[PDB]
Amino acid sequence: TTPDRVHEVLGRSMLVDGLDIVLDLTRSGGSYLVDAITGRRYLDMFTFVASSALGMNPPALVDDREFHAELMQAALNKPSNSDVYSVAMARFVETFARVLGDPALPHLFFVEGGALAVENALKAAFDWKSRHNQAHGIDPALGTQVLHLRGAFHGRSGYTLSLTNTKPTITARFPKFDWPRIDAPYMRPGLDEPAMAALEAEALRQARAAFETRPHDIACFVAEPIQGEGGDRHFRPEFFAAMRELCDEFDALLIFDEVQTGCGLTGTAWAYQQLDVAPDIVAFGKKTQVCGVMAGRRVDEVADNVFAVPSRLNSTWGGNLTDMVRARRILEVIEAEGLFERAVQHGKYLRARLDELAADFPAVVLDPRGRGLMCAFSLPTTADRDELIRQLWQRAVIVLPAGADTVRFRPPLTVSTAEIDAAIAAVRSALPVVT
Amino acid sequence: TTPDRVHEVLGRSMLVDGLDIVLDLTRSGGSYLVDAITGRRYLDMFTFVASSALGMNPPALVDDREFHAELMQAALNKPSNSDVYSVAMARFVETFARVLGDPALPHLFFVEGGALAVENALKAAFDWKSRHNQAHGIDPALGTQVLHLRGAFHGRSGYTLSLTNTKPTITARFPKFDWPRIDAPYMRPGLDEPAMAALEAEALRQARAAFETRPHDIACFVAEPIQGEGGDRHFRPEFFAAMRELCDEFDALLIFDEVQTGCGLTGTAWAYQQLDVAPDIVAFGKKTQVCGVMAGRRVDEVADNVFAVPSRLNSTWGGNLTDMVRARRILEVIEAEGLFERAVQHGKYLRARLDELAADFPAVVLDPRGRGLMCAFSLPTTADRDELIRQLWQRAVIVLPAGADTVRFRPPLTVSTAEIDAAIAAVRSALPVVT
Ligand SMILES: *Cc1c(COP(=O)(O)O)cnc(C)c1O
Ligand SMILES: *Cc1c(COP(=O)(O)O)cnc(C)c1O
């Protein structure tokens, strides 16, 4: 079948609501997607929903003939890594630990899919709480609830549907656990230190109330360090530091969902490293290709936890071996080329341009914000936001919406300042048209 | 790192409870795994937990230089197939529909992981029931329960943990929905037609009672056509035909979990094709590499079902593109070489040898059984079963346990009769030692 027949062929079997283009797998590269139908190049600030660290066909991978052989060996088959170990697997695991590891979180577990990474973090917590309860004369049937935020997105699986609360479309008509949900005290424009502190105190009150009215039954608090799908909502470190203390007071684990923030986007391996809060468990995915959890801190206080006892966590494959081999090469590039530091510097650049945009269009470009390359701004109404996205598409720039009124930038870690300038130039061209 | 250091490297980060070997990715082939440490060849009746249709490094894939180029193009990157379409993707989808498709089940949806394939089938059903309820003046809050079997294994995710009930280790201390569970009327040795009919009638009574006491609230019945992890338990077609009628009487969907039975193992594309029962939805995975659902029949009666309305089902990647390209080549081999028919004929061979074994060891080899290459027998006690597996391992034959006392065979579709003879020869050698 031919590029111009792709949408037709797929439309016989599936709902085809994606992009108008057909991806050219060979000619795409770096910060550009190529439409196989026209040959038009599209500037990529979307990166497969932030799941591509280096963009398409990175030179370091494409030109590495030794790596080609290793990738081909992995790609021909699909072993169950749960049961059957390989050198390819071990090299990925040791490089993951070296580049992204945290000495407090030594337990690694891999799985296909970001929602399942979050679920395995939850399962670790439910088990830990029940066993901790038991060891202290509390009923082991207690420890089954998850404290979480309004505006959270943690995935579309059985447990994470009880947590995710962004668009009603995602969760409607699906059975859910009644788990406690608190307000998200995110930073907003024109709130001073004491105004922020008061917003945080209210969420903290709600959190405490949940712990006190469901005694011994809350296993964990889970959060995104920056809420992505909910609208690039950033939180002060003070808020998470307070939650860290409150979790310890009630013997509950703190879990960060770094599926979107992780692997260098904010300028450090993990966003939590910049907030100075130590989680007990971190769920990761997207840019890591293989998904999973890192666990430690208080997890180790329960000797028969899910990382110590066989068959408590599992899947058939234990992650995709091809993804492991690709991720390990990507991690080596990140380490070798200092890409976390590049994210810091280019992230400062992108943010400075967004501040400039806000200065030039004060009633239109609202709340420019970001940490590293994870940047966004908002529009007055959702109609303006939707129109801006259409205008950018017409100009061959791909960006994603978030929430009711946000436009988010998700460039690759390898983005150049000229590429950022081109994205900003397109936004400047489009804005007078939307107003 | 070196083959002899693999277990050491992994043991720093993970629980290492898998096989003693290190898989040689290059030298393994067909029905043999090669240990990279010793060079010892292992006869493979395990196939990555039945997830390998052709075994390792099939010649048709390894020798196909055009396919190498296509696989490499897919393997270098990992697009979000949910949003971004490719020729590689469309070719997989059209070949999937051609080789495994059912004209009554035209809606296809793909995802990474077998538990999530089952979950998306459940989500389709919950949505369908709620919308069907609504369209008939019933409260749309109703339609949230799943009728299922004792001994079922449907995965380890948030919804499937409420269904799976084999070993307590899998489900203990994890929150669950209270969903109705009925006895499984599987075939057992020394039960005649009327004895079987009476067992089935009792499960059918329990099913009816569930529908009557939870009115409008059961969205679906889900079953494995042959229960795998629970012990290779086979059901008469009569039982599923009765369940099909009862589902229609109470406006509930029938879903088969073919993750283990599917893609030719029983001798047809799907096990349900041999039971003459039409499901509304089928979940697939393992051998298909990419997982997902096929849906149709009554699903289409609700016009705004989950396959017709954007954003009701989703994941970031929409399945792994590398898996799609590999699966499409595997499907082409199956079709070209008549592998379903080969499974029928070699399955008859394997079963005949197991009958012979039962004749020679009547108090030890119990209940030889199978459909196609999906075959098993049981031992008197779990200690005998565990010992037989150890004895086979010592003889370089890999098989899997199931349930309390079952040994299961999961050979590749390409297994030869000489390879089956070698497996049977090892069982014959080991048996006197276990007795
Ligand atoms: C991407 C996303 C997930 C879900 O990951 P999938 O691979 O789509 O299931 C979970 N949490 C966050 C914060 C996400 O961005
Ligand atoms: C393999 C299995 C699953 C779970 O699939 P995973 O990929 O391990 O999540 C679901 N149902 C059945 C019948 C299975 O055999």
UniProtKB/Swiss-Prot annotation, chains A, B:
Primary enzyme class: transferase
Binding site for 2-oxoglutarate: R156, Q260, R408
EC number: 2.6.1.36
Catalytic reaction(s) noted: L-lysine + 2-oxoglutarate = (S)-2-amino-6-oxohexanoate + L-glutamate
UniProt binding sites for L-lysine: R156
Post-translational modification N6-(pyridoxal phosphate)lysine, affected residues: K286
Assigned protein family: Belongs to the class-III pyridoxal-phosphate-dependent aminotransferase family.
Name the record gives this protein: L-lysine-epsilon aminotransferase
Organism the protein comes from: Mycobacterium tuberculosis (strain ATCC 25618 / H37Rv)
